[PDB]
Amino acid sequence: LSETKCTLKSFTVEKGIYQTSNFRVQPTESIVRFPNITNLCPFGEVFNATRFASVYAWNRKRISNCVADYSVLYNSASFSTFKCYGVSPTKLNDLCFTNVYADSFVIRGDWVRQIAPGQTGKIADYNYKLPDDFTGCVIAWNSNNLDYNYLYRLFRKSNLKPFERDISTEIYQPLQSYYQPYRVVVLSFEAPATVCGPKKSTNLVKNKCVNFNFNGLTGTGVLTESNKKFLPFQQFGRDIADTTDAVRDPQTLEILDITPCSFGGVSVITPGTNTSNQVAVLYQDVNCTEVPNVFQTRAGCLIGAEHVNNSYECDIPIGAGICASYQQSIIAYTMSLGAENSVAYSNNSIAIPTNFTISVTTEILPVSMTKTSVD
């Protein structure tokens, strides 16, 4: 009742039914499922390499079939730059990727700023370009306490496409030798997952409301066995709102259906607060066994009203033929459409008025509205 009062911004409530809130079942536990992968990803093969390629001819290492722990680099104290785009550097271990690509090259300190999406310049345009829709992390460090003639492209007919590597040496109507040396590794983040961060798995739980993470896919809902005929390559299905309604368990290859946890509107049935502070609550389209004088109707689960067999004129409508009233306590009943009357019809019988009455009735109609004006 207090909820109704706050909803209506008043300390009094008139007779009627009001929607004040929403019922929702909360999750009990978190179900985490990742592919069973044992070996660690060869990031070190790129980062602790004896030699890095020139910027005009950068190298690419493909990372696949492995566990990608990025906290070793993030916390590693050695870098001058650790800038992530589209992802966060401290959340990378909770992500799964189709592929991870580690690009590596040598640059001068004054180009460090060019290793980014949305950039222009001699490196950004002729040697190493990132797309504006870039997802990945750029990691760079000062390597002048470690280390020769490295080249960059100075002349070209046109600019490079994202991730293009032009290593030709035609004459321009192109390369020049390289203020501290920097080593740069760019981790580009790209189906079933192939590369996942350390995240331990839990047991699969079904027929309960749970939080979940399936191979990087997150959401809340009830998991049940699916009868969907997934093809051997399909991992998940999608609805018209582009939501996930089924997944393939990454360890058991079991197809699970996802049904969002029960919820529905909550409305309060009340006589005016001038008469009584008793209320009844209707859980719209909710089953009374899910909600925890309990009357299940088509409108929803009505709790607090006593159902009776006597039919009365409708007072506060519930829906589907059911009305409620205060008679004291709150009751629920099927509404009457009026008293019955059998007319004494016969092929030779007529009824004729022998008297009459003069009646006066009232009809009220709106004619006009306040003439507001807003500057």
Binding site: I352, I358, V360, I364, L365, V367, V374
Partner: protein, 211 residues
């Protein structure tokens, strides 16, 4: 007068219009407290702190939000205005057909048979008092479609033939007023063989008793 004085909800139709518009205006004003992503809902507080290249960004958010709020208000008023116009047109029709005449339209000017109406002025509207005739205290009579007399079928000119159990009379339909069946209140069409349920009675010719 006694009925209206005892029922606060009687004018709910007029009060609803007042309440809906008042609610719409209060909603519009309250939206001025929303920042819509800005550092502040108040333009003066933005301007006293930020320089133009930064101030304009914060102002842009408030303009977008406030313009959207005002557009929502106006759209709702146009829709509501259309409903009021339809009501006013109905009220004008009732004035012409219920007050300036007598209507034959069922339930157009209230329940019962319309006699007349009287308008009364009301805040933002009109109230009609409809005066109607309602039949009362009906009685069971035996009837027939026609009377058979001297080989001819007699039908009522205006009323209906009724019997009180021993005698036949002709009466007006909406008020019992039995009269002797005569040649002046019936007409003849065809013989007594065609009509289903025809009964034998005497039709009085008001000539021979004097001639």
């Amino acid at each position: 007068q006694d009925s209206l004085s005892s029922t606060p909800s009687a004018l709910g139709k007029l009060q609803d219009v007042v309440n809906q518009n008042a609610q719409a205006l209060n909603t519009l004003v309250k939206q001025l407290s929303s920042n819509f992503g800005a550092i502040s809902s108040v333009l003066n507080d933005i301007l006293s702190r930020l320089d133009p290249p930064e101030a304009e960004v914060q102002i842009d958010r408030l303009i977008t939000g406030r313009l959207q709020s005002l557009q929502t208000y106006v759209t709702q008023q146009l829709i509501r205005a259309a409903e009021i116009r339809a009501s006013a047109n109905l009220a004008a029709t009732k004035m012409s057909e219920c007050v300036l005449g007598q209507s034959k339209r069922v339930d157009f000017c209230g329940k019962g048979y319309h006699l007349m109406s009287f308008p009364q002025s009301a805040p933002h509207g009109v109230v009609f008092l409809h005066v109607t005739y309602v039949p009362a205290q009906e009685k069971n009579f035996t009837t027939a479609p026609a009377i058979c007399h001297d080989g001819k079928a007699h039908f009522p000119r205006e009323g209906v033939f009724v019997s009180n159990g021993t005698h036949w009379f002709v009466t007006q339909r909406n008020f019992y007023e039995p009269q002797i069946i005569t040649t002046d209140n019936t007409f003849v069409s065809g013989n007594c063989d065609v009509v289903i349920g025809i009964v034998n009675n005497t039709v009085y010719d008001p000539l021979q008793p004097e001639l």
